[PDB]
Amino acid sequence: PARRTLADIIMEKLTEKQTEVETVMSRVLEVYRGVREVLSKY
């Protein structure tokens, strides 16, 4: 149980680190590629 609790605490710490990293770091495609190919040699 102590090892499982330590693993859960480590998982919570890893999730907190991931959240901190996320904080620190922070149909139209086809038709517009078609008009891109049209206007490339228009």
Binding site: I10, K13, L14, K17, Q18, E20, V21, M25
Partner: peptide
């Protein structure tokens, strides 16, 4: 000691 998984998580040169 943590935050290395997030360091390798970001893949930018």
């Amino acid at each position: 000691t943590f935050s290395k998984v997030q360091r390798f998580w970001e893949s930018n040169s």
